[PDB]
Design a protein around this ligand. Sequence first.
Ligand SMILES: [Mg+2]
Ligand SMILES: [Mg+2]
Lengths: 254, 254
Amino acid sequence: SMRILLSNDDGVHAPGIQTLAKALREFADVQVVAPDRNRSGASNSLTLESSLRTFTFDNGDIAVQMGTPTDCVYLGVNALMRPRPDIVVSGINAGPNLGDDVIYSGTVAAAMEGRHLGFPALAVSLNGYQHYDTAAAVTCALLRGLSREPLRTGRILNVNVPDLPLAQVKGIRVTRCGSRHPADKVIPQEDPRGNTLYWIGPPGDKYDAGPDTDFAAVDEGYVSVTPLHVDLTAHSAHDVVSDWLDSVGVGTQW
Amino acid sequence: SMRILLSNDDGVHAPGIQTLAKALREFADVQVVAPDRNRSGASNSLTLESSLRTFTFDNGDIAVQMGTPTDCVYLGVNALMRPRPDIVVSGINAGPNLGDDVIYSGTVAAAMEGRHLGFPALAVSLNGYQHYDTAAAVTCALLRGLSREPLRTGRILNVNVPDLPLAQVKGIRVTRCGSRHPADKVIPQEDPRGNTLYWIGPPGDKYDAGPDTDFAAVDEGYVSVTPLHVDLTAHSAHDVVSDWLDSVGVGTQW
Ligand SMILES: [Mg+2]
Ligand SMILES: [Mg+2]
């Protein structure tokens, strides 16, 4: 019987995470360890300068004080949940995590943090705010599915679900991350004393959102499943960087 | 003429950034934009629900008040530094960023924000903190030559410098990222009121530290340079996931 570490990114009381927990407690033992306040825009952010305070609740749900999504699952796996989870699922998130985004996503990061357990970790995001209903069903399918048969390759599955009633989601689709044009907008806004403060503001237009992409999938009406890894090496850049090095003679006398 | 945007993640006052600033500033035009405090572990996190305030010191360095490394370089290239920088150098970090430490590193995050400039972003990490001089020599050497001859491919370089006297470092190796075992340590500490607080342990043991890894290079006394990209998609796992979805009948009814 599956042991589930359920975290998320929107906080221990987000409709997203609570819904998923009810659905999952139907066939698995779930233990929630989530951050205490919506703070999305954390990435694989990790509290290193300070220790972490824990708070447990009425049920058994833990919230990490000021804790980051990676904070949560990390504490969850090596201290807080015992016996250890078999999987971590990163609880239904209010809003997409597609393309370039994924690198900055706290919800993707919680999943990435469970890349080492018996089962692949699931990140789950709704594109919108209404049909949490649907994302739960999708996750359960994915989960019963792992339980009859283990997946031999891919330790992070990044799922996004369209904001449509289950009956209208056309299927699911294995995808690749898309990309936007480089973001560059900064919105200045000035404080009552004259000084300029800056907002980061909105991401670039969609660049590669062709047929193979997670963007196209969701746009079409499919669950989009992207397998993620954690090796950022640009392997094909290799010889070029080496020729360069030799060409200009850094690291060499000759 | 070479306009450098100089960030780091240990904070604008760290000896790694300051020593780098000084070395660059005698053949290059430099602007420091960095966090106001030690922000190690910050990964790609960014401030989205708040505006950011800056502070300028008399030497012109700029700090982003509660800014993340990412916050800093985004604001650096797009608002703060005029005219735009030619390059982003992410200041000499105290401690290595090797293997999968990369997904958590604020140092590399700062460079990832440099992705779209003329020259490739440089992330520079020292494996200790005796010899910042050493990392400086390297970075300066990387930067010249870069300005003698462009790098035809690869937008982000993850540079790790052994913690030795320059004379003792054997050379340079273009490398690939290694990987660690799961981390499992959670160092507990009691509150003065008796409550268990949790500190996040260290990075796990080197696991893949093979012949051509970033680990191997540093341990043997070489500078490691790794080309990095931002695509999280595990492409080679595509068909396996696709066969698994079909084998389990999720997203098809037959
Ligand atoms: Mg969120
Ligand atoms: Mg640091």
